[PDB]
mmCIF file of C-alpha atoms and ligand atoms in Angstrom:
data_model
loop_
_atom_site.group_PDB
_atom_site.id
_atom_site.type_symbol
_atom_site.label_atom_id
_atom_site.label_comp_id
_atom_site.label_asym_id
_atom_site.label_seq_id
_atom_site.Cartn_x
_atom_site.Cartn_y
_atom_site.Cartn_z
ATOM 1 C CA UNK A 1 76.414 83.072 98.816
ATOM 2 C CA UNK A 2 72.754 83.712 97.251
ATOM 3 C CA UNK A 3 72.741 87.088 96.498
ATOM 4 C CA UNK A 4 69.604 89.180 97.783
ATOM 5 C CA UNK A 5 68.542 92.650 97.113
ATOM 6 C CA UNK A 6 66.378 94.143 99.982
ATOM 7 C CA UNK A 7 64.263 97.087 98.881
ATOM 8 C CA UNK A 8 61.710 96.767 101.647
ATOM 9 C CA UNK A 9 63.536 98.347 104.915
ATOM 10 C CA UNK A 10 61.708 96.355 107.515
ATOM 11 C CA UNK A 11 63.897 93.346 106.417
ATOM 12 C CA UNK A 12 67.300 94.369 106.059
ATOM 13 C CA UNK A 13 68.630 94.176 109.653
ATOM 14 C CA UNK A 14 67.089 90.747 109.985
ATOM 15 C CA UNK A 15 68.548 89.345 107.088
ATOM 16 C CA UNK A 16 72.401 91.078 107.642
ATOM 17 C CA UNK A 17 71.695 89.757 111.246
ATOM 18 C CA UNK A 18 71.452 86.045 109.956
ATOM 19 C CA UNK A 19 74.746 86.679 107.290
ATOM 20 C CA UNK A 20 72.705 87.113 104.070
ATOM 21 C CA UNK A 21 74.571 88.206 100.940
ATOM 22 C CA UNK A 22 72.902 91.724 100.733
ATOM 23 C CA UNK A 23 74.046 93.048 97.626
ATOM 24 C CA UNK A 24 71.639 95.861 97.430
ATOM 25 C CA UNK A 25 69.680 97.668 100.399
ATOM 26 C CA UNK A 26 66.996 100.219 100.720
ATOM 27 C CA UNK A 27 68.472 103.651 101.477
ATOM 28 C CA UNK A 28 66.716 104.121 104.404
ATOM 29 C CA UNK A 29 68.633 102.344 106.547
ATOM 30 C CA UNK A 30 71.380 105.255 106.853
ATOM 31 C CA UNK A 31 68.543 106.901 108.893
ATOM 32 C CA UNK A 32 69.175 104.118 111.668
ATOM 33 C CA UNK A 33 72.398 105.108 113.903
ATOM 34 C CA UNK A 34 72.108 100.935 114.303
ATOM 35 C CA UNK A 35 71.682 99.996 110.584
ATOM 36 C CA UNK A 36 73.669 102.888 108.779
ATOM 37 C CA UNK A 37 77.112 101.135 110.177
ATOM 38 C CA UNK A 38 75.946 97.725 109.086
ATOM 39 C CA UNK A 39 75.576 98.431 105.314
ATOM 40 C CA UNK A 40 78.391 100.687 104.501
ATOM 41 C CA UNK A 41 79.506 99.572 101.436
ATOM 42 C CA UNK A 42 76.188 98.239 100.412
ATOM 43 C CA UNK A 43 74.621 99.509 97.306
ATOM 44 C CA UNK A 44 71.649 101.779 98.427
ATOM 45 C CA UNK A 45 68.408 102.020 96.300
ATOM 46 C CA UNK A 46 65.325 103.469 96.600
ATOM 47 C CA UNK A 47 61.715 103.013 95.604
ATOM 48 C CA UNK A 48 61.798 102.711 91.751
ATOM 49 C CA UNK A 49 65.309 102.159 91.390
ATOM 50 C CA UNK A 50 64.737 99.077 89.521
ATOM 51 C CA UNK A 51 67.761 99.203 87.534
ATOM 52 C CA UNK A 52 70.026 100.185 90.439
ATOM 53 C CA UNK A 53 68.779 96.448 91.815
ATOM 54 C CA UNK A 54 69.126 94.906 88.592
ATOM 55 C CA UNK A 55 72.544 95.790 87.919
ATOM 56 C CA UNK A 56 73.819 94.563 91.497
ATOM 57 C CA UNK A 57 72.827 91.401 90.060
ATOM 58 C CA UNK A 58 70.503 89.771 92.813
ATOM 59 C CA UNK A 59 69.252 86.009 93.034
ATOM 60 C CA UNK A 60 66.594 87.202 95.272
ATOM 61 C CA UNK A 61 64.493 90.546 95.641
ATOM 62 C CA UNK A 62 62.374 91.480 98.582
ATOM 63 C CA UNK A 63 59.313 93.928 98.662
ATOM 64 C CA UNK A 64 56.612 94.715 100.325
ATOM 65 C CA UNK A 65 53.010 93.754 99.160
ATOM 66 C CA UNK A 66 52.138 97.541 98.395
ATOM 67 C CA UNK A 67 55.399 97.790 96.281
ATOM 68 C CA UNK A 68 54.280 99.162 92.613
ATOM 69 C CA UNK A 69 57.449 98.015 90.545
ATOM 70 C CA UNK A 70 56.685 94.068 91.556
ATOM 71 C CA UNK A 71 56.365 92.822 88.020
ATOM 72 C CA UNK A 72 59.614 94.762 87.274
ATOM 73 C CA UNK A 73 61.299 93.089 90.018
ATOM 74 C CA UNK A 74 59.788 89.787 88.695
ATOM 75 C CA UNK A 75 61.665 90.407 85.205
ATOM 76 C CA UNK A 76 65.140 91.046 87.426
ATOM 77 C CA UNK A 77 64.861 88.084 89.897
ATOM 78 C CA UNK A 78 62.780 85.740 91.843
ATOM 79 C CA UNK A 79 60.641 88.254 94.029
ATOM 80 C CA UNK A 80 59.595 86.990 97.521
ATOM 81 C CA UNK A 81 56.760 89.608 98.279
ATOM 82 C CA UNK A 82 55.952 90.165 101.727
ATOM 83 C CA UNK A 83 52.736 91.542 103.494
ATOM 84 C CA UNK A 84 54.215 93.600 106.631
ATOM 85 C CA UNK A 85 50.745 93.301 108.562
ATOM 86 C CA UNK A 86 50.796 89.292 108.355
ATOM 87 C CA UNK A 87 53.310 88.650 111.016
ATOM 88 C CA UNK A 88 54.514 90.380 114.098
ATOM 89 C CA UNK A 89 58.151 90.926 114.843
ATOM 90 C CA UNK A 90 59.083 87.561 116.221
ATOM 91 C CA UNK A 91 57.348 85.730 113.837
ATOM 92 C CA UNK A 92 58.871 87.971 110.971
ATOM 93 C CA UNK A 93 62.381 86.798 111.941
ATOM 94 C CA UNK A 94 61.318 83.095 111.608
ATOM 95 C CA UNK A 95 60.388 84.191 107.952
ATOM 96 C CA UNK A 96 63.768 85.643 107.575
ATOM 97 C CA UNK A 97 65.358 82.583 108.910
ATOM 98 C CA UNK A 98 63.368 80.550 106.287
ATOM 99 C CA UNK A 99 64.569 82.871 103.185
ATOM 100 C CA UNK A 100 68.105 81.996 103.975
ATOM 101 C CA UNK A 101 67.805 78.652 105.658
ATOM 102 C CA UNK A 102 68.622 79.839 109.345
ATOM 103 C CA UNK A 103 65.567 78.615 110.787
ATOM 104 C CA UNK A 104 67.372 77.224 113.943
ATOM 105 C CA UNK A 105 69.584 79.879 114.440
ATOM 106 C CA UNK A 106 66.283 81.871 114.664
ATOM 107 C CA UNK A 107 64.744 79.819 117.298
ATOM 108 C CA UNK A 108 67.778 80.406 119.440
ATOM 109 C CA UNK A 109 67.568 84.176 118.992
ATOM 110 C CA UNK A 110 63.900 84.175 119.936
ATOM 111 C CA UNK A 111 64.198 82.228 123.054
ATOM 112 C CA UNK A 112 67.069 84.245 124.371
ATOM 113 C CA UNK A 113 65.293 87.534 123.236
ATOM 114 C CA UNK A 114 62.292 86.555 125.063
ATOM 115 C CA UNK A 115 63.771 85.515 128.076
ATOM 116 C CA UNK A 116 65.900 88.533 128.721
ATOM 117 C CA UNK A 117 63.295 90.991 128.058
ATOM 118 C CA UNK A 118 60.524 89.273 129.850
ATOM 119 C CA UNK A 119 63.072 89.455 132.955
ATOM 120 C CA UNK A 120 63.507 92.984 131.842
ATOM 121 C CA UNK A 121 59.935 93.677 131.907
ATOM 122 C CA UNK A 122 59.763 92.417 135.364
ATOM 123 C CA UNK A 123 62.582 94.610 136.577
ATOM 124 C CA UNK A 124 61.127 97.760 134.789
ATOM 125 C CA UNK A 125 57.551 97.170 136.463
ATOM 126 C CA UNK A 126 59.800 97.169 139.777
ATOM 127 C CA UNK A 127 60.598 100.723 139.343
ATOM 128 C CA UNK A 128 57.532 102.614 137.264
ATOM 129 C CA UNK A 129 54.750 100.217 138.621
ATOM 130 C CA UNK A 130 52.945 96.967 137.109
ATOM 131 C CA UNK A 131 50.080 98.790 135.539
ATOM 132 C CA UNK A 132 52.154 102.268 134.670
ATOM 133 C CA UNK A 133 51.328 102.891 131.011
ATOM 134 C CA UNK A 134 53.593 103.945 128.201
ATOM 135 C CA UNK A 135 52.522 106.412 125.289
ATOM 136 C CA UNK A 136 54.136 106.534 121.677
ATOM 137 C CA UNK A 137 54.317 110.165 120.183
ATOM 138 C CA UNK A 138 56.181 110.309 116.546
ATOM 139 C CA UNK A 139 56.166 113.551 114.248
ATOM 140 C CA UNK A 140 57.133 113.261 110.684
ATOM 141 C CA UNK A 141 56.123 116.047 108.024
ATOM 142 C CA UNK A 142 54.778 118.091 111.134
ATOM 143 C CA UNK A 143 52.204 115.551 111.567
ATOM 144 C CA UNK A 144 52.063 113.687 114.896
ATOM 145 C CA UNK A 145 51.465 110.011 115.065
ATOM 146 C CA UNK A 146 50.810 107.195 117.425
ATOM 147 C CA UNK A 147 51.270 103.108 117.021
ATOM 148 C CA UNK A 148 50.364 99.598 118.463
ATOM 149 C CA UNK A 149 52.263 96.946 119.619
ATOM 150 C CA UNK A 150 54.054 96.108 116.204
ATOM 151 C CA UNK A 151 54.487 99.300 114.000
ATOM 152 C CA UNK A 152 58.309 100.366 115.222
ATOM 153 C CA UNK A 153 58.940 103.309 117.436
ATOM 154 C CA UNK A 154 60.039 100.826 120.359
ATOM 155 C CA UNK A 155 56.526 99.291 120.506
ATOM 156 C CA UNK A 156 57.166 95.697 120.166
ATOM 157 C CA UNK A 157 59.870 95.849 123.017
ATOM 158 C CA UNK A 158 57.352 97.939 125.206
ATOM 159 C CA UNK A 159 54.494 96.233 124.853
ATOM 160 C CA UNK A 160 54.991 92.458 123.802
ATOM 161 C CA UNK A 161 58.538 92.131 124.993
ATOM 162 C CA UNK A 162 58.619 94.140 128.451
ATOM 163 C CA UNK A 163 54.680 93.375 128.909
ATOM 164 C CA UNK A 164 54.408 97.109 129.473
ATOM 165 C CA UNK A 165 50.959 98.313 129.826
ATOM 166 C CA UNK A 166 50.028 100.340 126.488
ATOM 167 C CA UNK A 167 47.899 103.449 126.921
ATOM 168 C CA UNK A 168 44.286 102.793 126.731
ATOM 169 C CA UNK A 169 43.185 105.321 124.351
ATOM 170 C CA UNK A 170 46.464 104.580 122.240
ATOM 171 C CA UNK A 171 45.235 100.832 122.073
ATOM 172 C CA UNK A 172 41.907 101.801 120.877
ATOM 173 C CA UNK A 173 42.760 103.843 118.269
ATOM 174 C CA UNK A 174 45.717 102.201 116.844
ATOM 175 C CA UNK A 175 43.711 98.464 117.243
ATOM 176 C CA UNK A 176 42.243 98.864 113.561
ATOM 177 C CA UNK A 177 45.477 99.775 111.473
ATOM 178 C CA UNK A 178 48.529 99.374 114.015
ATOM 179 C CA UNK A 179 48.947 103.266 113.427
ATOM 180 C CA UNK A 180 47.117 106.661 113.612
ATOM 181 C CA UNK A 181 47.595 110.284 113.185
ATOM 182 C CA UNK A 182 47.045 112.381 116.284
ATOM 183 C CA UNK A 183 45.228 115.633 116.698
ATOM 184 C CA UNK A 184 47.653 117.939 118.205
ATOM 185 C CA UNK A 185 45.130 118.902 120.706
ATOM 186 C CA UNK A 186 43.643 115.893 121.426
ATOM 187 C CA UNK A 187 47.327 114.998 122.820
ATOM 188 C CA UNK A 188 46.345 115.045 126.230
ATOM 189 C CA UNK A 189 43.923 112.152 125.583
ATOM 190 C CA UNK A 190 46.556 109.852 124.230
ATOM 191 C CA UNK A 191 49.093 110.418 126.915
ATOM 192 C CA UNK A 192 50.090 108.225 129.516
ATOM 193 C CA UNK A 193 52.331 107.682 132.414
ATOM 194 C CA UNK A 194 55.365 107.375 130.586
ATOM 195 C CA UNK A 195 56.181 109.218 127.172
ATOM 196 C CA UNK A 196 58.431 107.853 124.159
ATOM 197 C CA UNK A 197 59.156 110.940 122.038
ATOM 198 C CA UNK A 198 60.970 110.221 118.558
ATOM 199 C CA UNK A 199 62.733 113.639 119.001
ATOM 200 C CA UNK A 200 65.958 112.942 120.015
ATOM 201 C CA UNK A 201 68.494 115.397 118.004
ATOM 202 C CA UNK A 202 65.030 117.094 116.721
ATOM 203 C CA UNK A 203 64.464 120.809 116.974
ATOM 204 C CA UNK A 204 61.763 120.953 119.626
ATOM 205 C CA UNK A 205 59.241 119.482 117.692
ATOM 206 C CA UNK A 206 55.437 121.588 117.464
ATOM 207 C CA UNK A 207 53.931 118.937 119.773
ATOM 208 C CA UNK A 208 56.778 119.488 122.524
ATOM 209 C CA UNK A 209 56.092 123.105 122.367
ATOM 210 C CA UNK A 210 52.528 123.548 123.104
ATOM 211 C CA UNK A 211 51.499 124.318 126.734
ATOM 212 C CA UNK A 212 49.341 121.110 126.560
ATOM 213 C CA UNK A 213 52.248 119.124 126.577
ATOM 214 C CA UNK A 214 53.995 121.022 129.243
ATOM 215 C CA UNK A 215 51.231 120.435 131.575
ATOM 216 C CA UNK A 216 51.067 116.411 130.814
ATOM 217 C CA UNK A 217 51.535 114.472 133.896
ATOM 218 C CA UNK A 218 54.331 112.766 132.119
ATOM 219 C CA UNK A 219 56.021 115.992 131.698
ATOM 220 C CA UNK A 220 55.287 117.041 135.013
ATOM 221 C CA UNK A 221 56.845 113.981 136.839
ATOM 222 C CA UNK A 222 59.894 114.075 134.375
ATOM 223 C CA UNK A 223 58.746 110.779 132.318
ATOM 224 C CA UNK A 224 59.419 111.621 128.959
ATOM 225 C CA UNK A 225 62.069 109.232 126.913
ATOM 226 C CA UNK A 226 63.266 110.730 123.990
ATOM 227 C CA UNK A 227 64.638 108.510 121.158
ATOM 228 C CA UNK A 228 66.160 108.825 117.735
ATOM 229 C CA UNK A 229 63.337 108.664 115.080
ATOM 230 C CA UNK A 230 65.025 107.245 112.097
ATOM 231 C CA UNK A 231 66.557 104.605 114.543
ATOM 232 C CA UNK A 232 63.390 103.779 116.056
ATOM 233 C CA UNK A 233 61.781 102.914 112.677
ATOM 234 C CA UNK A 234 63.120 99.473 112.713
ATOM 235 C CA UNK A 235 62.112 96.138 114.774
ATOM 236 C CA UNK A 236 65.088 94.339 113.340
ATOM 237 C CA UNK A 237 67.314 91.931 115.762
ATOM 238 C CA UNK A 238 69.998 94.351 115.518
ATOM 239 C CA UNK A 239 67.519 97.711 116.391
ATOM 240 C CA UNK A 240 65.472 95.221 118.689
ATOM 241 C CA UNK A 241 68.768 94.813 121.268
ATOM 242 C CA UNK A 242 69.503 98.545 121.224
ATOM 243 C CA UNK A 243 65.932 99.697 122.238
ATOM 244 C CA UNK A 244 65.847 96.918 124.440
ATOM 245 C CA UNK A 245 68.757 98.551 126.346
ATOM 246 C CA UNK A 246 68.186 102.124 125.654
ATOM 247 C CA UNK A 247 64.443 102.134 126.940
ATOM 248 C CA UNK A 248 64.945 100.003 130.100
ATOM 249 C CA UNK A 249 67.675 102.443 131.289
ATOM 250 C CA UNK A 250 65.677 105.741 130.378
ATOM 251 C CA UNK A 251 62.440 104.588 131.675
ATOM 252 C CA UNK A 252 64.158 103.592 134.856
ATOM 253 C CA UNK A 253 65.879 106.540 135.209
ATOM 254 C CA UNK A 254 62.893 108.447 134.351
ATOM 255 C CA UNK A 255 61.410 106.884 137.577
ATOM 256 C CA UNK A 256 63.670 108.794 139.801
HETATM 257 ZN ZN1 LIG B 301 67.305 105.990 94.912
HETATM 258 ZN ZN1 LIG B 302 74.057 84.749 90.746
HETATM 259 ZN ZN1 LIG B 303 59.196 98.729 98.239
HETATM 260 ZN ZN1 LIG B 304 55.188 87.547 106.384
HETATM 261 ZN ZN1 LIG B 305 47.410 91.739 104.844
HETATM 262 ZN ZN1 LIG B 306 56.797 80.895 115.374
HETATM 263 ZN ZN1 LIG B 307 64.345 76.296 107.296
HETATM 264 ZN ZN1 LIG B 308 68.978 92.688 135.575
HETATM 265 ZN ZN1 LIG B 309 46.630 95.190 136.985
HETATM 266 ZN ZN1 LIG B 310 59.877 117.019 111.701
HETATM 267 ZN ZN1 LIG B 311 54.405 117.863 103.728
HETATM 268 ZN ZN1 LIG B 312 50.312 93.573 122.186
HETATM 269 ZN ZN1 LIG B 313 53.135 109.135 138.088
HETATM 270 ZN ZN1 LIG B 314 69.316 108.038 121.850
#
């Protein structure tokens, strides 16, 4: 029952899934309608909350490689420092399987996940077309963002699992960093056949009100797929299975 403090929110759902003794978890899991329920009764910390982490007495601390309080956590407990960029969503769960020694439980999760989504992918393409493209549009702080195949927002399900085709210019732009800000008037340039927009529940965003948005072919064909932003930030086994179910139905229904 080794006590883990998960400061980096990327790896919270993957450890919970494997049954880790998470005694502390990043506050930001509360934004996910999948993960909030999984972590009720678990202490919420934010960045800088070293004593909040310390007080729950962790045997292990998990932080990002860009976390500034690493030396502070090193004084509290053994700190596993994780470079996000180093592993993709499946390899990332393999790593968490090592942390808790459930490496064989992950190999079975991976196999079933890959089987189901590949088979899902053949089905999705049957409705929308083999080379039908999907775009990612995400607003935060009134800025517009798009992503590669491994930066949340459904990308790892859409492009890796399902094998759907990524919008040609979105792929070029995000090939470098995995993410990129989009000029609200170059939005037509990155729009694809289908659009995943993280504006579910959100008041009609600035980019969903422009006349260029109303004139996109995806909008015209009713191919806008709206999803909750906070829920779609993640790429954990809990989130993955939800997005799998959610994206499949919303895309197929969009296909008339
Ligand atoms: Zn806090
Ligand atoms: Zn202990
Ligand atoms: Zn951190
Ligand atoms: Zn790693
Ligand atoms: Zn790196
Ligand atoms: Zn592997
Ligand atoms: Zn192992
Ligand atoms: Zn089926
Ligand atoms: Zn083709
Ligand atoms: Zn906003
Ligand atoms: Zn601001
Ligand atoms: Zn890819
Ligand atoms: Zn079309
Ligand atoms: Zn939703």
